[PDB]
Amino acid sequence: QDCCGERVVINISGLRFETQLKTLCQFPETLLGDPKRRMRYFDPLRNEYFFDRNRPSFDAILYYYQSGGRIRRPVNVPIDIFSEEIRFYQLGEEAMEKFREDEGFL
Amino acid sequence: QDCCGERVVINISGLRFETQLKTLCQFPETLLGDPKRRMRYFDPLRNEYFFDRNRPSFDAILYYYQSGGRIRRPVNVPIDIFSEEIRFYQLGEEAMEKFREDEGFL
Amino acid sequence: QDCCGERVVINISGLRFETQLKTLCQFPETLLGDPKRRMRYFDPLRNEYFFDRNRPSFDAILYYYQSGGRIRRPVNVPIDIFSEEIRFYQLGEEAMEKFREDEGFL
Amino acid sequence: QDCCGERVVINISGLRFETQLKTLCQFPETLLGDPKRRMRYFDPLRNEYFFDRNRPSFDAILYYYQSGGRIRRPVNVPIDIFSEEIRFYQLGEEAMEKFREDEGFL
Amino acid sequence: RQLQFYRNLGKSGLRVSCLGLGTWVTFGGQITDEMAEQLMTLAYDNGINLFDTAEVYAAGKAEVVLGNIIKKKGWRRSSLVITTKIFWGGKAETERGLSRKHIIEGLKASLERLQLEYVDVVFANRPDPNTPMEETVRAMTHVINQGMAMYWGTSRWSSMEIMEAYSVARQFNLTPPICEQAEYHMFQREKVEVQLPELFHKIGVGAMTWSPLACGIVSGKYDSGIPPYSRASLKGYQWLKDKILSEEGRRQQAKLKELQAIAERLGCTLPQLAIAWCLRNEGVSSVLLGASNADQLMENIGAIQVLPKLSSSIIHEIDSILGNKPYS
Amino acid sequence: RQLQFYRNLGKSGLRVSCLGLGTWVTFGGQITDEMAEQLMTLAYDNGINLFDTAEVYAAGKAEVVLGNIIKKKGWRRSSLVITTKIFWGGKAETERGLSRKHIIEGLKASLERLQLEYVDVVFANRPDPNTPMEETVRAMTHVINQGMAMYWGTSRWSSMEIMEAYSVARQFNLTPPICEQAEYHMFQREKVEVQLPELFHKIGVGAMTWSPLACGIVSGKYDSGIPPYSRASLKGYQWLKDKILSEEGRRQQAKLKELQAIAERLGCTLPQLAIAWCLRNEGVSSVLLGASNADQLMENIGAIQVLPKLSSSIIHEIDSILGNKPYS
Amino acid sequence: RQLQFYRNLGKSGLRVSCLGLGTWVTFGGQITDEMAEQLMTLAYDNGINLFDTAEVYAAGKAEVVLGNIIKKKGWRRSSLVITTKIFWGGKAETERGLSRKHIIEGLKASLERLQLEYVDVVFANRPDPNTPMEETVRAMTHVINQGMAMYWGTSRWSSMEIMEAYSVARQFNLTPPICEQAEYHMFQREKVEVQLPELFHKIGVGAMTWSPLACGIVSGKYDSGIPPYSRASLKGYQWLKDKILSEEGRRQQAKLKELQAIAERLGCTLPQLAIAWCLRNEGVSSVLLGASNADQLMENIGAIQVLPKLSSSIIHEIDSILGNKPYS
Amino acid sequence: RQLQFYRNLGKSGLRVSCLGLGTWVTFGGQITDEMAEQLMTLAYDNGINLFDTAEVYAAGKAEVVLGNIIKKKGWRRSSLVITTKIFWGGKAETERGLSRKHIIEGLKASLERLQLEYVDVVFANRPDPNTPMEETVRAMTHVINQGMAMYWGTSRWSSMEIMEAYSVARQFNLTPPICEQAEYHMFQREKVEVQLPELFHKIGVGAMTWSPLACGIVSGKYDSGIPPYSRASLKGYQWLKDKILSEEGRRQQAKLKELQAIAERLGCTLPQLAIAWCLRNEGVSSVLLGASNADQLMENIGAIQVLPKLSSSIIHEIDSILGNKPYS
Ligand SMILES: NC(=O)c1ccc[n+]([C@@H]2O[C@H](COP(=O)([O-])OP(=O)(O)OC[C@H]3O[C@@H](n4cnc5c(N)ncnc54)[C@H](OP(=O)(O)O)[C@@H]3O)[C@@H](O)[C@H]2O)c1
Ligand SMILES: NC(=O)c1ccc[n+]([C@@H]2O[C@H](COP(=O)([O-])OP(=O)(O)OC[C@H]3O[C@@H](n4cnc5c(N)ncnc54)[C@H](OP(=O)(O)O)[C@@H]3O)[C@@H](O)[C@H]2O)c1
Ligand SMILES: NC(=O)c1ccc[n+]([C@@H]2O[C@H](COP(=O)([O-])OP(=O)(O)OC[C@H]3O[C@@H](n4cnc5c(N)ncnc54)[C@H](OP(=O)(O)O)[C@@H]3O)[C@@H](O)[C@H]2O)c1
Numbered sequence A, B, C, D: 001q002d003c004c005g006e007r008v009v010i011n012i013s014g015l016r017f018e019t020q021l022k023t024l025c026q027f028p029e030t031l032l033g034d035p036k037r038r039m040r041y042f043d044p045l046r047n048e049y050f051f052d053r054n055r056p057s058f059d060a061i062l063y064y065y066q067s068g069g070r071i072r073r074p075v076n077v078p079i080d081i082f083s084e085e086i087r088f089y090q091l092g093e094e095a096m097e098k099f100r101e102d103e104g105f106l
Numbered sequence E, F, G, H: 001r002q003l004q005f006y007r008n009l010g011k012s013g014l015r016v017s018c019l020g021l022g023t024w025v026t027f028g029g030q031i032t033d034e035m036a037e038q039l040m041t042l043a044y045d046n047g048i049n050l051f052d053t054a055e056v057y058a059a060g061k062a063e064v065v066l067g068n069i070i071k072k073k074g075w076r077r078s079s080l081v082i083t084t085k086i087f088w089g090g091k092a093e094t095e096r097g098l099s100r101k102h103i104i105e106g107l108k109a110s111l112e113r114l115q116l117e118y119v120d121v122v123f124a125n126r127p128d129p130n131t132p133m134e135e136t137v138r139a140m141t142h143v144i145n146q147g148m149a150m151y152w153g154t155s156r157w158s159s160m161e162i163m164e165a166y167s168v169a170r171q172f173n174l175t176p177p178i179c180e181q182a183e184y185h186m187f188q189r190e191k192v193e194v195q196l197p198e199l200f201h202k203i204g205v206g207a208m209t210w211s212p213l214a215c216g217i218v219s220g221k222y223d224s225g226i227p228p229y230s231r232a233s234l235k236g237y238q239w240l241k242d243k244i245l246s247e248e249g250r251r252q253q254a255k256l257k258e259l260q261a262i263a264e265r266l267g268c269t270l271p272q273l274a275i276a277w278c279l280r281n282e283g284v285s286s287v288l289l290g291a292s293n294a295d296q297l298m299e300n301i302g303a304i305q306v307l308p309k310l311s312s313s314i315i316h317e318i319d320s321i322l323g324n325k326p327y328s
């Protein structure tokens, strides 16, 4: 389970993101870091994972994996939509605590 | 008329959006939810629907279908342009009333 | 010279825009509305026009053709860069006067 | 070493940028302007350079080459992330000094 | 109007007459070879260029006798349209379905029996649940690109399966189908009238309908009982004889008497009105006929004269008599 | 300058001489086979490598006699450029148009009549309104990929149809056309001069013009009336005889007298000036000639000497005499 | 249940029986041609349609005798599934590997020795480190598109290499593989059980397992020593004889005695239980058998009766006796 | 080390020995057929599998005698690598260049003269300015897909043209080239050493160098003058004789005396050191040799022994003597 080298394409409502597998398998307890949980979104005809979800929220989700654990909400996205995206992608309790600490009232 | 499973590609001036048909047929009285009204925009050579219209306004239109009925104007789009887009895509009277209530003076 | 029906693809530094020819030939005195002036940017291997220029400025340029003549500067673009883009795309003296009137000091 | 004519495709996490080689070889002491330093990011199966990095920061990096040397931070990007991107792409000491002068406290 | 009046099959460039001749029960079975040659000569001399067969008819033997006419009379290949259907090829497990192996082997065996180099259209006779759509579309594109066929189409598919085949062909840069074969007569009206116009307006798939006389029911020969030397009195057609002699058949015969009164008022016969009723809309490109002797074929060709007499009042009167118009 | 001076056909890699020999009315019709062999030998010995025929000329018979020269004299296949045109193939409904079936069958029949394995360019003789553009471009790409042809081009198409064919070929990764055949002489100047340079500069499509002497009008032989053994006195050419003997023909003959005075001042003949006038611009790659005997061909070859004498003053004087320059 | 019960090979449209017959050591070597014809007739009369060979077996000679059965008995080609494996072709440097040249030449030589026009599946026998994956996938797509094969698969590849081949095929619009051949018996359980279900659920690649009796070890014939006329007593099989007569073999024989007690309780024999144990899950499509005489083949066919008797208690008891279940 | 030590040609799967035999001046010209058969037998018995010819050598006649060896001795086709080069095919205008027509016709004529079905690599002998790159890449992909060749490469192209061919092949999903033929000896060092490693590291294009002894100059036979029965004394090689007898040749002979002193210190001969000097880096895959008799070939094969003796000190001493190392 070295999980390295391969390139992964993620399709969010027509918007395409590309990354490496060793970026994703730094956090094995999330939705994208676990092969058992993301296998139901795979598309065999196009070799990609498809999600029918909110488009501007996924850049912060990808930067959470790329930066090593930093959560920063985008300016044009409200609080509850980003909270629902964090709850869907299963980033954990400490990511929610860091998001509450970074956004004032928490 | 189960209207489920198939993937639909919508092309707004070169910007591509992908969704499912059961997302679109939740609201059968709109332009995109009715097969009789959207059939004049179909492109047979590319298997997509093409609209020669405003590009930043369509993300809120897609999130209206994806969120279940919530209208939120983008920050970088003026009032009258978004009102003309709501009038073109035929979202209804109650969507206009919700947009007026969510934007102050209505 | 009916100039109607055909679809035109414009490539700005990797960002692709699609429109119709009757949208472009409403203003025959500009760079994109004249076939003699835009013919030096055509790419025969890809069937598109390529410009090696600023990416966020072209949405307002396309909305000038699509809306019938309205000029609105984007928020994240400075004054002089947008003025240089208006000067490059040859929109005319009255478009510069409308841009000066819409931006305060003119 | 005329370095002119050819088109170069740069892929930043799924976001594609296209430019000319004579735009890139104006600054031969940077990462993108030197063929010896950018050769480890080349993908032979797709004819592009791939970087697994931050997506909204690269528009200012491309406009630094296209405008002739002007540095302007995007609005939705913080200070330290853009400083790390300037340090990665090896723009030089005078670009860092111009970025410090353009951002107040430097 | 229908025969020696040509129209495009769907939106493609292939032009056919709107009457065709079929190669079911009669050919190789009920009738002899000389009667088959007489029927083909009578069809060809009146401007019909469409002939449709399959590999399951009379264990393939009908296809053999079709070749024995075409090589005999010396007709040009460029003036004929020949179609074949492939689903059933034998008793083994690998000799049926819509896999790549059976499509290639069945088309080669059918071209060997027909003494031809290619057919014009090759049809899939029924959908296959055990095969992916991508394999079927790639096999059809492969046999078109090898010169063994020119076009391909479907038969007895639903609208979702045809749309899935179109989407798979557009995804991988392959060849979409052009036509669909469906059943259509006065007592079977749903699929042609409420489902297929959307596919014709959207992706340009035409329709080629079969059994216009409901295996001889709407001809009106069964008003008393079962006459000798008919299809219902043959061995192996007990289902048709049970369908005629049931309780719905008497109501169908009474409605056929009323429609025969209308057709005798118009100056024609009931099979001519039944054939020309199917061609009143532009979604139907051609109608495949079946005949057992030359008098039936010469009567069935004469629906061209009664086609332009169908006004809206006669159509509304027929729809009032039948009472089975589908809601859309 | 034109013959034994070679140039690219459009922007492709095929290099042709700027004089070609045509296979219209004379071949298989007006002249005999020995005269045709003499004309082909005289054309081949002067460096002409371009020969153009079609399947509609003399019911195909002209193509047959073209093959009977090439197999007889034993010329190498690699030193010749042979082109064919396909629209009309017979009296049946499926034997005309630009569908896939007729393109494949007509090219196979033309290759069988020519006793060849392949042609160099295959042309579509006129546009087809009943066929989609995608089917035509896919059929041309298919016959190129099977080794039956090397290139393909159009004839009598407008600019929008050529641009649509290019766009369809670029969309589905297919083969674009390389050349267009258009009519061009001193009284037909619009399409070559105002429409085709944009297509040459944009997508690199060249032009191969036909009828440079307007079926013999600009040669000046009809100054008195209709001489015997001419094209206007043949059976089936009443339209040309009515065109000559109308009221516009007298004004054309007066302008031809003035142009003959200019050509006699230059030291040449009027057909040589008329042929070399068509090659003064770089948008025209080749000019197809027609001849009825060896003296006419030997006179028409001699326009190479009068091509470099055309300065801007003589061109301006010719445009002042003609008075039909199109505005652009 | 396994033989004359057909299932899809992976997710493709090819349907096979779950027992196949192999062409290793016996064919061309240990047994004669009459015994091979008797074994093939006995396999074909019970509903087995899958036969697997390779070009390295008996210097290719086994393939020759396979052809000498198929042309002799006159079986139909459409009722058989024939597979071949290509890695080793000779002693020269260019006669091995998975390059384009050796794939084309080895498939042509194997089709020449088999007296056939095509095979159904062509396998790569082992991975090649000196060749790029794109060249191998393009060569397999080329030999499929020329009609020399219908499908292709891998053998002894890891999961990363199969996923890389799928990704390369999806990148350049090529043909992905459909099947993987792996070793699977009661003492070799890791790769089939923990790695291949992810590939079956993700990209639909099936498994076709080989050596179910561990070259005769799990049959139980080596409980005393090495009997004459066995595989371990042949010339060139010293490795198997050293593997049997080592210290792990005694523990394997004791576990085989306990499993023989279980199989005698169930009313069957130990090879039937060992064969039917491999087919208890849906990830395995077929099992390739080896036999030396007709009694062994008639015993090995009888595992169909003992397949539905395997409940969860007997499987748990077998896993308690064996004690080598892989953790996942 | 070089011969009977095999390596990949570039990054492809084709494996060649690092010594090859060329088919220039000797074959069909200077030497007889029996000497050519003796040279080919001596090359084949030592493990050399690479043989390189062209269609311009001795008006094609050399290719003919190459076929007359291969059919005579009965060698297997799968153990040989045969390459051909195509630019010049005749005196006509359409018989030269890199257009589609000349590539297809020249490859068919070369395969007819060689009595073969296919070659392994087909080279473009020089770049063509009159043809677009897309037409050349599509023609090479077409002749690979028809089974007439396996790979293709370039010769005397610059780096920008090879990169343009790669970019065009990646744009339209076509086949990129794998190899480049360049000139490389001790007095021609720029292109192999400063330009080609970037193309090898970037897109994996290998190099196959020619003329290692500078047409016999670095062998040292011209230390006095022009001996009889040499290449410089033949008819039609006045340029080589003027190059030897000029003022730079004396300095080259003095440097050759110093290099001969070094090679005599190492225990070898000067041509063996000159051949083994070219293979000291990993960017060069193979070296093509030329020989006039069997003693020269047996001497040139012996550079394998002197290849591993080249340390860094001897390379630095040779670079100090030569004094023409390119700056990078
Ligand atoms: N796509 C598919 O799966 C499929 C399936 C089935 C058929 N088809 C096609 O359908 C085509 C039509 O076959 P069909 O026989 O069912 O069409 P049909 O016209 O409805 O059958 C008419 C039958 O009634 C009799 N008949 C014909 N004209 C008559 C007349 N004026 N008066 C009295 N009887 C008359 C004929 O023989 P009798 O007098 O002996 O009854 C004939 O067999 C076939 O050729 C086949 O190619 C396709
Ligand atoms: N793309 C298309 O659809 C199309 C259509 C038509 C033709 N074409 C091509 O056009 C080519 C040219 O045919 P064309 O005959 O129309 O060209 P043309 O050169 O304009 O016709 C000249 C005619 O006048 C006569 N003539 C030739 N030279 C003469 C001379 N010095 N003095 C007096 N009379 C002379 C000849 O016979 P007479 O003396 O008996 O008159 C000849 O038939 C044909 O071969 C055909 O391939 C193409
Ligand atoms: N993908 C690959 O690389 C690969 C590699 C190897 C094999 N294979 C395939 O595997 C297939 C199976 O070959 P296999 O021989 O290894 O399978 P196997 O069934 O495990 O071998 C059984 C051996 O034991 C003997 N035997 C069979 N039934 C017996 C019974 N009831 N009682 C006692 N002895 C019995 C037979 O001869 P003896 O009595 O003389 O021992 C037979 O040779 C081959 O045909 C080949 O196609 C594939």
Ligand SMILES: NC(=O)c1ccc[n+]([C@@H]2O[C@H](COP(=O)([O-])OP(=O)(O)OC[C@H]3O[C@@H](n4cnc5c(N)ncnc54)[C@H](OP(=O)(O)O)[C@@H]3O)[C@@H](O)[C@H]2O)c1
Pocket: H021, H022, H023, H024, H052, H053, H125, H155, H156, H181, H182, H210, H211, H212, H213, H214, H215, H216, H217, H219, H221, H229, H230, H231, H232, H271, H288, H289, H290, H291, H292, H296, H297, H299, H300
């Ligand atoms: N890509 C291209 O365009 C291109 C162009 C040219 C050649 N090539 C290839 O290059 C290959 C090599 O040809 P080449 O002749 O130029 O290579 P070379 O090895 O440099 O030529 C050596 C010449 O000197 C002589 N010689 C060889 N060994 C000798 C020895 N020990 N002592 C004394 N003399 C010796 C031989 O004949 P003599 O004694 O009579 O001189 C031979 O002709 C050709 O086969 C051809 O395929 C390719």
